[PDB]
Design a binder for this molecule. Structure first.
Ligand SMILES: [Zn+2]
Ligand SMILES: [Zn+2]
Lengths: 257, 148, 67, 145, 145, 114, 48, 82
């Protein structure tokens, strides 16, 4: 009737990829945790850009989109900065957003590559991922680019530039045991990475009393957030959403009674 | 006591027309005591079955074994009247046709009752003194268990 | 035109690999080994680097309209 | 269609006396089967005579107070023989109107479906004999038509 | 001409077969997408060992009121009617709908599509016009989900 | 030109409530939750956690339309256990679920880092 | 042209002594051009 | 004509049903008295349909026979097809 007892085991914790296994958990819980990874994890990204001078062949909208989808590190201060909509500050303030200044001018014969390194911030804890660098626009001689950009706080439901993951992979029941997929020719399908069968066997035998469990994750960050703190941020966001649901449901049930 | 049919059956055919559906197989059965043949569709992945296997069959209107009607609603929290749970395979369905061998002169020297378990069907040729409990448009249950 | 920063399907960083892709192509490497050396295990980014044609060298051959 | 149910033109010229030669709209009409044109004379006499010489099938199909009234009261017997003669001349009329044995024909309301509905709404048992006197059917059809 | 087409029909075909069986978590969500549901979960066709619902009871819950209909599936074997197993149908042909309950058969274009005497046609000619609209909407919700 | 701004998928303006309670009249002891401005992410959790409870007969969710950011959850229990407090228990054990998972992930990270 | 019909529309259908419809295959003639007025006036054709 | 010698199908068809349900509802829209008690609805179509079910519609239908002579029918003796 109550919550069960999940266990976690970590198989790889490199600088940009994390694989972990969650056991003793229903399918919907793991699916929701996967969904929150790519939709509702807070991150700092550029949303407000102001173009002062743009003589490039790449016009204003190209540059605005490319600067919007440049990832920004938010490993520690993503919790500190509030949302711009919830800020009592009007328009923007340094407490509610991060200001970016970009100024570049080409006066040489060879092509100037305006990359993400040329972006200059005010807070040193927000910077594009250079600590190869991301190309933005190439300039010929005599072509300038001057702009100011503001970075807000948002998650993946608004826009894909606020999606912190590179790409999440979600595997449960690796060798087929619950017949959640019906293979017409089981011998023609490659074994999974986490399969536990020999070469002769194709699928696991039928389990009528089984239940989907032992989920395999292969979540991968885009270099903005660390690939181990993204899971903690996702779980914290889910917990805060359900606490808000607690408060709203309690208010409604005291209002009705 | 609510039991409409009591018999012990044995199988000889698993799929004489072929393996039509992957998860449903069509059994062919007959008894050894009162000589009624049987055909039946049984799920396979939740219930293995093979040739030469002996089982006894119970067909009852209600599982309560008290004569009280259940009215056909799923009540998982109503296990208080101690339903017929000692048998390990339970179906639920209705009849749709009861036809026999009439020549409009005598009265049903043999009866063949058709029962639909939501698509899984059976059929029971036999004497009318064993199949007179079945009435058209009536909800019935099916009980299965293995025998040694 | 120009290489996108993100893969359309997943969102892995693409914009910091075009110069490296041309650099590995210039050093006698095939496309498969160059893509494997850039850490693009998934084919969604492999098709982004493989099937992208660059037009900026065609567009920077023109005199700018201002100075 | 004017309010006299006669199909007329703009300047009131009669095209059809009734819509579709019968005065029925085409939305509700259904595909039906006559089941009288195709059977032979022996089959028609076997399936529509209402014989009562053997008297045992009639006991099996009806109740005792009904078979007592059927086996007597020869006016009832004459009425059912008149119905059989009417159905015989109707078979002749259907054979004259319809050649080539095209038993498929469109009629408004599908009789077999309503009979099946009446079977499965009132929970009648086809095994047990029913309580329905034949002239109730006879003058029910006559008073209906 | 109002007829199930392109996706919902071929999903009704796979949802209507004998071999499909839904756990409690599948019927559990399929009963949410109804509008004419009375609010009572039907008794499953399988109880022990685990409660499994076949798709024909779900489509019986779709069918409103008490509809009686007999159609044949597209791959109906012509030798089944003459020989035995006429009402057993080992291929699960011979769609019969009895008292608003789907009994056997896999539905197809000949039963739910734009055909004369189809299930939706009888649903229009018996229940009415609003109930048919709810029938179509309930099909397109639950079968797609 | 009729593109909705992206923030109304989860924001609430002035005029609607987060939770509204409707009592179903077709069957006794039923409720109609109408959680507004979430998606299947919450609804799948609610359905699974309420199916984990043994004394709940009916508890499912659906979306009326993918455009209107709204889910509706219909919960029916035994006639001795309110659906509202069933929802309350299904959330207050879920809080412990997520907190326990967070703590175990934290200690797994700490153990993996030397 | 001469051909025995296979579709029942152009086949001979009559009543029999048992009252059962029977499919009779009879020779039919299909022509090119219309001269019906002299065709029915000719010997051994059916004017019906 | 008089009460006798009055022939027309007594089933009030869908066309005059739509016509009456339009005209009387527009009469509510132009603030006419309502012939039936209503319980908390404001759409003239809904109350007009409700009083068409109640068969208390205060207009008559003048039907044009193709001969030329008129024929007057009210609502309360016509019966609803539904
Ligand atoms: Zn501010
Ligand atoms: Zn990619």
């Amino acid at each position: 009737p109550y919550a069960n007892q999940p266990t976690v085991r970590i198989t790889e914790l490199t600088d940009e990829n994390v694989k972990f296994i969650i056991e003793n958990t229903d399918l919907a819980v793991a699916n929701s945790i996967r969904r929150v990874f790519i939709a509702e994890v807070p991150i700092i990204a550029i949303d407000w850009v102001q173009i002062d001078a743009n003589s490039s062949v790449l016009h204003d909208e190209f540059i605005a989109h490319r600067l919007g989808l440049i990832p920004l590190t938010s490993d520690d201060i993503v919790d500190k900065l509030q949302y711009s909509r919830d800020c009592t500050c009007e328009e923007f303030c340094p407490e509610c957003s991060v200001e970016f200044t970009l100024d570049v001018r080409c006066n040489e014969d060879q092509t100037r590559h305006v990359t993400s390194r040329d972006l200059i911030s005010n807070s040193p804890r927000v910077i594009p991922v250079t600590s190869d660098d991301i190309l933005i626009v190439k300039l010929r001689k005599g072509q300038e680019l001057r702009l100011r950009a503001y970075a807000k706080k948002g998650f993946g439901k608004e826009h894909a530039k606020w999606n912190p993951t590179a790409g999440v992979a979600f595997e449960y029941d690796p060798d087929n045991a619950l017949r959640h997929t019906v293979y017409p020719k089981p011998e023609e399908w490659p074994k999974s990475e986490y399969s536990e069968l020999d070469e002769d066997e194709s699928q696991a035998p039928y389990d009528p009393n089984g239940k989907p469990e032992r989920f395999y994750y292969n979540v991968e960050s885009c270099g903005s957030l660390r690939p181990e703190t993204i899971v903690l941020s996702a779980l914290s966001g889910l917990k805060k959403k359900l606490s808000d649901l607690q408060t709203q449901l309690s208010h409604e049930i005291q209002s009705d009674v | 006591a609510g039991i409409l049919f009591e018999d012990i059956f044995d199988v000889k055919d698993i799929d004489p027309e072929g393996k039509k559906f992957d998860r449903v197989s069509r059994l062919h059965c007959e008894s050894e005591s009162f000589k009624m043949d049987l055909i039946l569709d049984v799920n396979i992945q939740i219930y293995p079955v093979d040739l030469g296997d002996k089982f006894r069959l119970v067909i009852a209107s209600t599982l309560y074994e008290d004569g009280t009607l259940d009215d056909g609603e799923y009540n998982p929290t109503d296990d208080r009247p101690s339903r017929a749970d000692q048998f390990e395979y339970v179906m639920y369905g209705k009849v749709y046709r009861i036809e026999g061998d009439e020549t409009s002169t005598e009265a049903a020297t043999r009866l063949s009752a058709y029962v639909s378990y939501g698509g899984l069907l059976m059929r029971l040729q036999g004497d009318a003194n064993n199949l007179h409990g079945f009435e058209v448009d009536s909800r019935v249950y099916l009980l299965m268990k293995k025998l040694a | 035109m120009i290489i996108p920063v993100r893969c359309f399907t997943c969102g892995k960083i693409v914009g910091n690999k075009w110069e490296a892709y041309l650099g590995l192509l210039q050093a006698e490497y095939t496309e498969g080994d160059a893509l494997d050396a850039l850490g693009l295990k998934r084919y969604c980014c492999r098709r982004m680097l493989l099937a992208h044609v660059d037009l900026i060298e065609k567009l920077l051959n023109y005199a700018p309209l201002e100075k | 269609v004017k309010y006299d149910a006669t199909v007329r033109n703009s300047i009131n010229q009669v095209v059809q006396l009734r819509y579709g030669e019968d005065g029925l709209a085409g939305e509700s009409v259904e595909f039906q089967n006559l089941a009288t044109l195709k059977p032979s004379n022996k089959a028609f006499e076997k399936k529509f005579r209402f014989d009562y010489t053997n008297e045992r099938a009639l006991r099996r199909t009806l109740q005792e107070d009904l078979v007592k009234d059927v086996l007597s009261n020869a006016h009832i017997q004459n009425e059912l023989e008149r119905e059989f003669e009417r159905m015989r001349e109707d078979r002749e009329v259907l054979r004259v109107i319809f050649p080539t044995g095209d038993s498929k024909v469109v009629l408004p309301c599908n009789l077999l479906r309503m009979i099946w509905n009446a079977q499965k709404i009132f929970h009648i048992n086809p095994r047990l004999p029913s309580d329905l006197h034949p002239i109730k059917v006879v003058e029910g059809v006559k008073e209906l038509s | 001409v109002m007829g199930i087409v392109q996706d919902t029909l071929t999903a009704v075909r796979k949802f209507t077969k004998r071999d499909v069986f839904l756990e409690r978590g599948e019927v559990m969500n399929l009963l949410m997408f109804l509008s004419t549901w009375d609010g009572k979960v039907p008794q499953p066709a399988i109880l022990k060992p685990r409660p499994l619902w076949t798709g024909k009871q779900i489509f019986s819950l779709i069918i409103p009121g008490h509809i009686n209909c007999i159609r044949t599936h597209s791959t109906h074997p012509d030798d089944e009617d003459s020989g035995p197993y006429k009402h057993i149908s080992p291929g699960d042909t011979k769609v019969v709908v009895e008292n608003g309950e789907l009994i056997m058969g896999i539905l197809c274009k000949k039963s739910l599509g734009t055909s004369a005497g189809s299930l939706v046609h009888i649903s229009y000619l018996e229940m009415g016009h609003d109930i048919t609209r709810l029938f179509y909407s309930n099909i397109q919700t639950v079968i797609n989900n | 030109m009729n593109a909705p701004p992206a923030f109304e998928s989860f924001l609430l303006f002035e005029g609607e409530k987060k939770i509204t309670i409707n009592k179903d009249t077709k069957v006794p002891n039923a409720c109609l939750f109408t959680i507004n401005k979430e998606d299947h992410t919450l609804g799948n959790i609610i359905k699974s956690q309420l199916l984990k409870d043994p004394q709940v007969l009916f508890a499912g969710y659906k979306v009326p339309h993918p455009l209107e950011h709204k889910i509706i959850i219909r919960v029916q229990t035994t006639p001795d256990y309110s659906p509202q407090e069933a929802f309350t228990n299904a959330i207050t054990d879920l809080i412990s679920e997520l907190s326990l998972l967070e703590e175990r992930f934290r200690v797994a990270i700490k153990d993996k880092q030397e | 042209y001469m051909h025995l019909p296979q579709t029942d529309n152009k086949k001979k259908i009559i009543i029999t002594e048992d009252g059962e419809f029977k499919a009779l295959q009879e020779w039919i003639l299909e022509t090119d051009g219309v001269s019906l007025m002299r065709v029915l006036s000719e010997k051994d054709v059916d004017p019906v | 004509q008089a009460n006798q010698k009055r022939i027309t199908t007594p089933y009030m068809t869908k066309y005059e049903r739509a016509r009456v349900l339009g005209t009387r509802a527009l009469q509510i829209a132009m603030c006419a008295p309502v012939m039936v008690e209503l319980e908390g609805e404001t759409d003239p179509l809904l109350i007009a349909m409700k009083e068409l079910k109640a068969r208390k519609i205060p207009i008559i239908i003048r039907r044009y026979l193709p001969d030329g002579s008129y024929e007057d029918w009210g609502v309360d003796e016509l019966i609803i097809s539904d």
